[PDB]
């Protein structure tokens, strides 16, 4: 029988691989089910068997597939010195991503790095790292966070494949996952409203679970679904007593720092 699952090409540029790691924490479905039954994951450096020229050949085979493909991009694009500070198989990352982007059916940026530029773009930006849209002038479906929840990434992938492009906000993020502030769903919200704050991490107020706003919490300015869905089915930063860093916001390394202050 002639069969085809939609082709996904996943590129790793200037990244930490935490977005790949987040993706494999999916439980609805688990990653095996996703790649056996739902998608055809045709290039993915972290887990693929082929290496070297065999891997490059697998990429080219996917990019030239007659059925077309969806492009997942992990990491920012280092542009200084002709793209040479980030290379795979002897080619600048910006060149390969540009080529893949030009024929993709759709482009999903997994993480704040591919969406907006991320950690390597932070001042003074040694590599002149850029987000994908920033560098290429193409529209992307952004699944930011550092890393995003698998629920948001796998949810977006499944949406794209079954429903179409989900409604996106002005930062390119699906409203399904990114439509609400972290703070609006935070269980410490009643403390915030009552101006009940922890003044320090060692304070009795911190022990009591008071709001972390005075310790820098960026939940009030950060769009994400963290308190609602949790991470790893067990926790999220504020539940572990630590302020939100703002990690799903563009350029947060520069706009949300100092992290323990309200700048």
């Amino acid at each position: 029988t002639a069969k085809h699952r939609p082709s996904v090409v996943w590129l790793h540029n200037a990244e930490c691989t935490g977005c790949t790691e987040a993706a494999i924490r999916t439980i609805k479905p688990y990653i095996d089910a996703l790649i056996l039954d739902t998608i055809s994951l045709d290039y993915q450096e972290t887990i693929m068997a082929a290496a070297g020229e065999a891997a490059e050949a697998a990429l080219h085979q996917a990019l030239e597939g007659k059925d077309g493909y969806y492009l997942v991009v992990e990491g920012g694009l280092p542009t200084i010195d002709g793209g040479q500070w980030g290379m795979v198989a002897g080619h600048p990352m910006i060149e390969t991503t540009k080529k893949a982007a030009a024929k993709a059916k759709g482009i999903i940026c997994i993480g704040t790095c591919s969406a907006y530029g991320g950690v390597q773009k932070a001042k003074p930006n040694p590599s002149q790292a850029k987000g994908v849209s920033e560098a290429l002038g193409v529209k992307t479906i952004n699944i930011p966070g550092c890393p995003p929840n698998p629920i948001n990434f796998v949810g977006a992938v499944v949406h794209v494949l079954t429903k179409g492009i989900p409604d996106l906000d002005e930062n390119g993020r699906p409203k399904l996952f990114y439509g609400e502030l972290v703070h609006d769903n935070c269980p410490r919200l009643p403390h915030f409203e009552a101006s009940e704050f922890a003044p320090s991490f060692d304070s009795e107020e911190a022990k009591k679970g008071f709001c972390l706003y005075e310790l820098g919490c960026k939940g009030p300015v950060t769009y994400n679904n963290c308190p609602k869905v949790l991470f790893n089915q067990v926790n999220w930063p504020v539940q572990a007593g630590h302020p939100c860093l703002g990690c799903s916001e563009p350029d947060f390394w520069d706009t949300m720092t100092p992290f323990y202050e309200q700048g």
Binding site: H4, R5, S7, A14, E15, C16, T17, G18, C19, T20, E21, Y30, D32, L36, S40, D42, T46, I47, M48, A49, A50, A51, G52, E53, A54, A55, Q61, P78, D81, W85, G86, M87, A89, V119, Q120, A122, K123, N125, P126, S127, A129, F201, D202, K207, G209, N232, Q233, V234, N235, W236, Q239, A240, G241, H242, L245, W253, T257, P258, F259, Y260
Partner: protein, 545 residues
């Protein structure tokens, strides 16, 4: 029984190295089917040390954690230890315990995924699993591992059926162009062993979710934990009964998988590839230790780590030297940095990027070359294992000797690619053996004491060092504070030690040395290069930062 080896003479370049973290190009020169020279060429620079300059030292751990998301947590921990040392705060006992448990959880997650998802495909012909008799496979599994339902013929057949449907679909996905397709002489396993391993590969994808959930009970989330602060930790809930009960339960499930699947599979594979106990050796080993009972200073960390610190040189297991933090430096001679940067202790570190061209053998990597008293050092599970074994650490003596007896090899056989692989499993088993003790310690401490963060003040000017032995080895972060801001922040990371380029004297790094003598059965499908490179568990985002 001879190890397969072609007559190939010529260059081989493997770029990308897949099934690692980050972007690595390996070049080798081969003569008569054996590697005679090697280069480890890291292909991405981000520049986190540069980015940190002028920033709030409290922010460092958040930036440096993003050196890598495979070894998530460990850089947050090293930066937190580093800033705690620079501000001269001693974290509370509960924070030492919690930080060390999160490290233990990380070891379990990381090593399980490495063995199955990164390394196994170099040893296991997945397509050959379709040829196995699942009853014979079940009988074999019953002889080599504890009884378990996932090793039943019915379960193994269900795996075979899933794999058969996938292969016959025409879309091989992550197996496209795999080196084992069509048969490969360097792949030795019986089909039944391939099937058992493949079944466990799939189970491990589910088990690693549980390992990460355990870690997140204490860490807040995985990847990229968010529970450490200057002076300790923030997660008061993690000291309490129900969360720790769930942490124990999940950790016990993960450890059951380590003991039932990872170790037996590792030993089965090792048994068929005993020739790889003579390939891929190096001679010098370094560890900062981990799992210390006193983390009030870097010196106390070195002295009280339950996985001990030390230095071994020249394969001499009869002597382990103390680590002298003053003797660490990094070279840039063969790296993509400005001339003039050789010989820098990390408190004097310089990060001045200067690219030349691809394959310039004078400047071929974005990694620096860390050296110790003039020598390259291998770091990681094998280093820890040799240091602990040499010192008579009782858990390492027991588990190492178990492996030596099962394989009928001496401790010297561990100076090898097979040994490096084995050590990773040995230490995973040891971490598992200690989880209940460590969890009980923290549960009893947290029940009687809820001090989790110490008071501290930012000094105008200071310096500090944070040490950890991360899953891949000896990690150190080094800060100079001036004007209450970061004046210099240098990371020296385990993959920097292992997979950096040559040092100032032209001396090969551990991976470069280890690659000398590698046999190549098929130069178009050089799986042997991958076996050794993967055994070091490379992380190029870590190594370069």
């Amino acid at each position: 029984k001879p190890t397969p080896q072609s007559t190939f003479t010529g260059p081989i370049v493997v770029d990308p190295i897949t099934r690692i973290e980050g972007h690595l190009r390996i070049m080798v020169e081969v003569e008569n089917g054996k590697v005679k020279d090697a280069w480890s060429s890291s292909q991405l620079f981000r520049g986190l040390e540069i980015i940190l300059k002028g920033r709030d030292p409290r922010d460092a751990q958040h930036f440096t954690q993003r050196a890598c998301g495979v070894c998530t947590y460990v850089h947050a921990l090293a930066s937190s230890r580093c800033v705690d040392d620079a501000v001269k705060v001693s974290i509370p006992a509960n924070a030492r315990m919690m930080r060390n448990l999160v490290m233990a959880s990380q070891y379990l997650h990381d090593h399980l995924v490495h063995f199955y998802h990164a390394h196994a495909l170099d040893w296991v012909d997945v397509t050959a699993a379709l040829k196995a008799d699942p009853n014979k496979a079940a009988k074999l599994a019953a002889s080599i591992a504890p009884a378990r339902p996932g090793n039943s013929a019915k379960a193994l057949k269900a795996v075979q059926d899933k794999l058969k449907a996938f292969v016959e679909s025409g879309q091989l996905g992550i197996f496209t162009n795999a080196y084992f397709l069509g048969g490969h002489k360097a792949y030795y396993l019986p089909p039944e062993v391939d099937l058992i391993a493949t079944a466990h590969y799939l189970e491990a994808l589910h088990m690693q979710v549980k390992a990460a959930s355990a870690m997140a009970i204490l860490g807040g989330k995985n990847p990229h934990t968010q529970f450490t602060v200057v002076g300790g930790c923030s997660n008061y809930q993690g000291l309490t009964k129900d969360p720790l009960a769930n942490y124990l339960a999940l950790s016990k499930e993960v450890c059951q998988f380590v003991n039932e699947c990872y170790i037996p599979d590792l030993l089965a594979v090792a048994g068929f590839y005993k020739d790889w106990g003579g390939i891929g050796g190096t001679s010098n080993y370094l560890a900062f230790g981990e799992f210390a009972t006193d983390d009030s200073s870097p010196e106390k960390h070195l002295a009280t780590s339950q996985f001990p610190s030390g230095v071994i040189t020249g394969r001499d297991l009869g002597k382990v030297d103390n680590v002298d933090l003053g003797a660490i430096y990094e070279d840039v001679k063969y790296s993509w940095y400005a001339p003039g940067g050789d010989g820098k202790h990390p408190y004097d570190g310089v990060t001045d990027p200067k690219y030349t061209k691809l394959d310039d053998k004078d400047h071929y990597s974005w990694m620096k070359a860390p050296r110790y008293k003039g020598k390259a050092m291998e770091v990681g599970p094998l280093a820890r294992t040799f240091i602990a074994y040499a010192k008579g650490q009782p858990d390492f003596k027991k588990v190492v000797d178990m492996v030596l007896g099962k394989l009928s090899v001496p401790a010297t056989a561990l100076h090898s690619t097979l040994g490096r692989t084995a050590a990773r499993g040995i230490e995973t088993a040891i971490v598992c053996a200690n989880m209940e003790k460590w969890i009980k310690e923290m549960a009893d401490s947290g029940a009687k004491d809820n001090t989790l963060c110490a008071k501290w003040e930012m000094p105008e000017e200071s310096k500090g060092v944070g040490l950890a032995d991360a899953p891949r080895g000896a990690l150190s972060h080094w800060i100079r504070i001036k004007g209450k801001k970061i004046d210099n922040f240098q990371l020296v990371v385990p993959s920097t030690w292992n997979l950096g380029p040559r040092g100032a004297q032209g001396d090969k790094s551990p991976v470069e040395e280890a690659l000398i003598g590698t046999p190549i059965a098929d130069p178009k499908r050089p799986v042997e290069i991958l076996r050794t490179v993967h055994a070091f568990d490379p992380c190029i985002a870590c190594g370069v930062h």
